Design a protein around this ligand. Structure first.
Ligand SMILES: Oc1ccc(/C=C/c2cc(O)cc(O)c2)cc1
Ligand SMILES: [Fe+3]
Length: 479
């Protein structure tokens, strides 16, 4: 196939499209014997050249990578997420769906079809592997064979059109907590709040409305609440009719924070909204309650972080104002009015792709891990450091991948099911950009600054990844 000669399909973005198996990858150092499970991650990877002259990275078909770590070795398996899109285009021999989140650029033959690329998260829950994309139901797969089952509509009990790619698991109940925005159609202000039992059943689905339609990419949960940030990366049908990127950023609009009680029969009037001045925030580290306060830790930038979803008023992209920092948004359920109680910058380190020890989701956490952009480092060819913060001592650790590499999202793996918070490992893919290959790095999570304890060579160049997760062998049929 002939792909376009553009930055989205060349260099680091050259198409790969590899399905593969490798046993016992070559490595340096010591792979911890204590690791027994698998790290799943997803890369957008176009099956076909795009319908339009160009495309963006968020729009490639989801390709799922699994690193099965056991007995001191790492095995590699990679397979397509066989979405309806993937199947339809595979049969036609060509692209049928068009631009990102824009059905007006699709072939008439796929009108009304689910558009998901399942390319944003690879998540294990309830014995299934979930390949997720926030414009559609999630695609469920077999975590062991990595075959595709199909889209999860919960037998038809799901009434919304969409399902998040940033699900959260409630440690108290074991439920998956999810939202689905644009729930009644593209660009609508309807959102569902959903919980899924460990058994896979949709046990709650609550419809509500948000102040305005926007990219509701992530959210937080607390013991009693779902915490939803409303950030003005906005879209509209008018944008799509005109061929603009679906989203653009409006610096003139306020940011809101919605507090949704996690209970049955929640009404619109039960939801509380707080309001602050414009900023950009996408990913949520964690959120928790303290007394009457809710703490909501996100990575906040002064302005838009997506150059390909541009400023709606024509402004050129401002790299400096896209630097994000871990920030606590604090609201007080006992106050009157909409003002935030506090907006507290927690580090001067520029950081994104935040992660916690997910066993403590919705509770006060001591540790966070991030990708860091350290603009003071040499670059001889961009997230170039792993960053850990101990929020109780304030101590920060940094590990630099060197001047010819970059890093993908870290994932925390507990040492044992009863281990203290953060007692375990970080795994992450490293892009060896000059050598055109990839490594899987393994760190001691509380001592990242000494460097990885193992470097596992991947003889396939991996593409830009989005989100990834660990599951123990007994959760994925590999025990
Ligand atoms: O369909 C998609 C929609 C949104 C996203 C968001 C990705 C993202 C990437 C970053 O580097 C920082 C960030 O805060 C968010 C990915 C896929
Ligand atoms: Fe994300």
């Amino acid at each position: 196939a002939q792909f376009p000669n553009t930055p989205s399909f060349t260099g680091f973005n050259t198409p790969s499209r590899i399905e593969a198996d490798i046993a016992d990858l070559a490595h340096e150092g010591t792979i911890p014997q204590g690791l027994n499970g698998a790290f799943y991650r997803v890369q957008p990877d176009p099956q076909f050249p795009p319908r339009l002259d160009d495309d963006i990275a968020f729009n490639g078909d989801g390709m799922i990578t699994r690193f099965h770590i056991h007995d001191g070795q790492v095995d590699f398996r990679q397979r397509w997420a066989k979405t309806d899109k993937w199947k339809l285009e595979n049969a036609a021999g060509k692209a049928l769906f068009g631009a990102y989140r824009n059905p007006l650029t699709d072939d008439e033959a796929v009108k009304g079809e689910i558009r998901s690329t399942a390319n944003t998260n690879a998540f294990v829950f309830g014995g299934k592997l979930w390949a997720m994309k926030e414009d559609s139901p999630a695609l469920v797969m077999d975590p062991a064979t990595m075959e595709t089952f199909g889209f999860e509509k919960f037998g038809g009990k799901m009434t919304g059109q969409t399902f998040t790619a940033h699900p959260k698991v409630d440690p108290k109940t074991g439920n998956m907590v999810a939202i689905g925005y644009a729930a009644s159609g593209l660009c609508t202000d309807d959102v569902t709040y959903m919980e899924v039992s460990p058994e896979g059943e949709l046990v709650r689905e609550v419809w509500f409305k948000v102040p305005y339609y926007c990219m509701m990419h992530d959210f937080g949960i607390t013991e009693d609440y779902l915490v939803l940030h409303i950030v003005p990366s906005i879209g509209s049908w008018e944008r799509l009719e005109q061929g603009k990127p679906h989203f653009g950023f409006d610096t003139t609009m306020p940011v809101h924070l919605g507090i949704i009680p996690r209970r049955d029969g929640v009404r619109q009037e039960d939801i509380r909204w707080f309001t602050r001045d414009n900023c950009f925030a996408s990913h949520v580290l964690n959120a928790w309650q303290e007394g009457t306060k809710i703490h909501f830790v996100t990575c906040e930038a002064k302005n838009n972080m997506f150059p390909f979803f541009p400023d709606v008023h024509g402004a050129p992209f401002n790299g400096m104002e896209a630097m994000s920092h871990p920030t606590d948004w604090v609201v007080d359920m006992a106050s009157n009015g909409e003002d935030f109680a506090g907006i507290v910058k927690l580090s001067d380190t520029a950081a994104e792709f935040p992660r916690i020890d997910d066993r403590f989701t919705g509770q006060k956490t001591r540790h966070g891990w991030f990708l860091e952009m350290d603009m003071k480092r040499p670059v001889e060819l961009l997230m170039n450091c792993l960053f850990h913060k101990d929020f109780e001592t304030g101590r920060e650790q940094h590990w630099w991948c060197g001047p010819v590499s970059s890093l993908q999202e870290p994932c925390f793996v507990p040492r044992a099911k009863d281990a203290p918070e953060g007692d375990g490992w970080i795994v992450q893919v490293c892009n060896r950009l000059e050598e055109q290959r990839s490594d899987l790095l393994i760190f001691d999570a509380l001592d990242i600054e000494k460097g990885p304890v193992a470097t596992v060579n991947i003889p396939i160049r991996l593409r830009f990844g989005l989100h990834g997760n660990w599951a123990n062998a007994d959760e994925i049929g590999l025990a």
